[PDB]
Design a protein around this nucleic acid. Sequence first.
RNA 1: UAUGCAAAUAUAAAAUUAUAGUAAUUAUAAAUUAUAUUAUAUUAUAUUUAUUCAUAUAAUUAAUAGGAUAAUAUUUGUAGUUUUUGAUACCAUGAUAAGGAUUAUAAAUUGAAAGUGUUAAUAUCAUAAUCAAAAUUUAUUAUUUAUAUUAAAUAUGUAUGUGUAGAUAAAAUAAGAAAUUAAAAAGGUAUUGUUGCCCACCAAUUUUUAUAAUAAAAAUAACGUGCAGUAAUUAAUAUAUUUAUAAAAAUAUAUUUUUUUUUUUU
Lengths: 139, 49, 357, 157, 139
Amino acid sequence: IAKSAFGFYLARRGQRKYPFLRRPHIKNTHSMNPSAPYFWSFMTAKSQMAFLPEENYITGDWTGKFFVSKRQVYTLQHATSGAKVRVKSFPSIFEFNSPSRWNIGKEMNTLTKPRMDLIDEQMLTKKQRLDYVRAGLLP
Amino acid sequence: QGAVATAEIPAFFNERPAWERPPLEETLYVTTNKERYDDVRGGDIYYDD
Amino acid sequence: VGYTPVNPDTSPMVAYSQYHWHYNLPQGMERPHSVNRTFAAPFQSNHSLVNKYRGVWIEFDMHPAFSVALEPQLRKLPRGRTLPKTPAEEVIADYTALAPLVDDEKTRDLWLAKVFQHCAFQRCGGAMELWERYCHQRFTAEGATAKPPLSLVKSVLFYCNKTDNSGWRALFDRCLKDGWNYTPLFDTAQWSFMLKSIGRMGDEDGVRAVLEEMLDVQADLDRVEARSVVIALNAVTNADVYEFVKKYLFNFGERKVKFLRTTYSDLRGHGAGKLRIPLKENDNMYYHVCWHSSIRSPRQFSPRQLYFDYTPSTLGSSSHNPNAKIDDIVKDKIEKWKAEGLLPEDYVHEDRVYDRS
Amino acid sequence: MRHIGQDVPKRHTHFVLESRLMYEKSFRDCWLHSVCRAISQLDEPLSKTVVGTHQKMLQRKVTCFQYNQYGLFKTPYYRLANVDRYHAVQGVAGTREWVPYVNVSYWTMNKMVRGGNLLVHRVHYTGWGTDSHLKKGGWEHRWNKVLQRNVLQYSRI
Amino acid sequence: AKPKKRPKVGQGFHEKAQKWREEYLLDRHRALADSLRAYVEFSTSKRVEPWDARFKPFDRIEKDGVYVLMRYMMEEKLQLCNYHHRPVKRLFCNIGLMGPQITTKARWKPYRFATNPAGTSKAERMYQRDKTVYTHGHN
RNA sequence: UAUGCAAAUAUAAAAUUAUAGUAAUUAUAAAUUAUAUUAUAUUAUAUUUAUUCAUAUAAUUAAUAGGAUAAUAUUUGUAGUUUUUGAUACCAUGAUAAGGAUUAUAAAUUGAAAGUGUUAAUAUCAUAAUCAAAAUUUAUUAUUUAUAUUAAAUAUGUAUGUGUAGAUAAAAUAAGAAAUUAAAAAGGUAUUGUUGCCCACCAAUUUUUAUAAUAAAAAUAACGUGCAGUAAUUAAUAUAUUUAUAAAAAUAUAUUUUUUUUUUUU
Ligand SMILES: O=c1ccn([C@@H]2O[C@H](COP(=O)(O)OP(=O)(O)OP(=O)(O)O)[C@@H](O)[C@H]2O)c(=O)[nH]1
Ligand SMILES: [Mg+2]
């Protein structure tokens, strides 16, 4: 059960059908979907000639960003500079402490797994743990 | 009969004919249209003296 | 129903109720309305007229031959809405060196008026010697009989107001009705400049005389600028002229007095830098202007502020007051009876109850 | 603030004003953003005057300017949430919880039609109404007819 | 009234989630390299004949019919195209001498049946492909 | 299961209860209340199709102020801190939905009023609100099946396994379907009306007769065990026997204040 302010304000109204590609809250759970032949044409800008998004650059006289935007595309300088790179994700943040050259040119949201396979055994309740065991997700 | 609409007629369309009116009704009588201070419970809230 | 109101124009239920016109009934105009014809308001604009000249005009009009002859000299003198930045001493020297040559009294007067206007625009106070050289001997001296042109007198007044000269009265008294009688032809800009100059100069009687003359000659108080009136009314300190100002302040309109108060407040507060010369502190006039604006403006209703300290009657609130005086009513009745004479006059009355405080 | 002497019954009604302001910002920025986007990613030469380096350098500079434009209204219209102006209830366009003509939610529409607050006419629930275009082709046909009435009717100069 | 802060995520979950994400990213790098290798090798390797030998155009004996044309005219380029369905269909279109017979009358084996290697002789080969390779059904 | 031991409702009566002293009347009646079509008869029902269903995020809601072609306002540039307190992260009265079983052919519609998150009086720490790129564990949802398969906002890598258990969904309206079917009776001791009266026991206070280690009777809104009676879940009433936590229960015999179903010499 996701806990957020909008959860009380809005209502799911069951498994309602939305217009194609027009769900209100976008949750790209398929960003980390791997596809070798379609590596450059999945969750990425369609044209190779397009410039990098505005989110990859600093515009004004900034004082500092806690985390960079997900659409910011990983570049060589991200690994070469050896600086601190963080991306907001559940639960709190994901930090790039393993700079690799195999992710150059791909978006950080594509690199980061949205739906983490790991399940917390601590906050899980008795009934919820029983449900997970019945589903097979937990022993 | 019950009313079916409401119009803002300028009140000279339906006047009291002169022969059943007090004499000239202007200088002899001074008339002021004020409002009752008691509970009307239905009636002329704004009545003239 | 609910906190949100219902708009009757959009709601069809109200529009089709018995208190409005149903759609089945014929749709037609009822009781045609003429509001703009029975009583049409004059055009009063919140914003000032953008295309206004906003200055004193001199009505420059001479013979075309003289104008074209003096064109090389007149290029330096100000034209219609065009002000050259030539030094004032240059035009003064040109006039004092070429005026005897040209033989036309009217042309000389117009040229001197233009010289005065230029030196007033430049705020050059040295040009009064020109007036003493040329005009003083024949236009105003020991009972001078000459009739000066309106252009020249207006230009001289503008110059003296700009330079805050003390010689304006000798000309204004001649310009009263018993003399030249040029007062009705003075523009509201001229009146505003006179009032501002006198207020800056701090003349107690000048402001009174100018205001009385304006009222007599039907000068447009509303179109007279608020700042000049504020400066003129700031300088009055004497009791008699202060009373005159108090009784005269009712001539202005309600909007005019409200904006006079606004301008006075802002100028003596934040707008102190707007004036080149700071305004002197006159708290009496400031308070009276604020009070007069409050009197003239419509009075709103603030019940809590009005009746914050209101206390009910002793008899009315006796039940709700634990320690209240009730024998005071009996004492008042006894006093009333003694005054009436029913009781013996000045009879000794002893306290009827104990004093609980 | 902080629910001290609140005047409106609902706090969320101010989000309607916020949405109107974001629409006004879109009105401001819709031309500049579109022009910058068009210039930035046009590979073909613009004209005889600008070609090659004179064009690519210009594209880079205009893209830099667009990025430096702080507060540009990037977001599209379809991703901006629609909130009723009467009861501050959110509805998403394209579903049945929002009407396009009145710009109010399904609940507000039902309340207003059940009371007397909006002059509407009743039609059969399982029909195509009374419009000839709706009877003919339906939603897409009436949409295309609106387009034809607006633009395609005119022989543009 | 009087709201209080309530923990949502586990006390040690954040760092565990971070290290799990890092390890998943490294595993994705390894799988991406493997998938690229497998896709390139599949594209280069020769595949089976994509034409059905049971329909009207491809029914004659190998010594007659369209097979003579294939063997004597376009045989050389089939090895270079590695018998993939798209290039063989395009070559059949461009060679002429067949006209619309490759689409109006000819038929081809399905997408997953035409991707089998040169010698298969078994139906269940398509399910023997590696599963950890994220080549999107390209062996 | 009558041989003995055993007067006994077929009524000469004076408001209830009680030993003929305990409390203040006690009983009873009528109307109404959801259980029972009958077999030609106000309609032939009986066929087709379908079922691995999932998503919500980064806090400030409490004023009016007019400009070109207009007979003149610097009102260009309009400047008075601070005593109140709820739709907010509970609660803070009302109001729309879904749910087909008997008014039919005919110049005609196969969707209901009994109520569904947001809406109009109860207050008393409440800053929870989208303007993108986001976090399945939650009843209420028709997905494309084997010749050709990723180009423009970024858009799904998963589950091939004899059309395959249980359980379950939909349609008799421009579609194609045809002889066994709706149509009886039958009840309140309840009136707070079954979520009801009422029953003893348990438990608690206390009164009267009594002085005998007595017994008996009576009053009482909340407990405990039950569900005995109230057409009331194997009917009830009377007497006798018997068992025992308690209402009671089982038998023997006799009754129905038990609601009822057609055979005039086959
Ligand atoms: O009504 C207004 C408003 C503003 N000002 C501003 O006052 C400034 C000068 O300040 P003052 O207005 O005090 O000077 P002054 O008496 O010499 O002004 P004039 O009569 O010559 O105009 C000027 O630069 C003008 O912008 C006015 O003069 N009048
Ligand atoms: Mg029972």
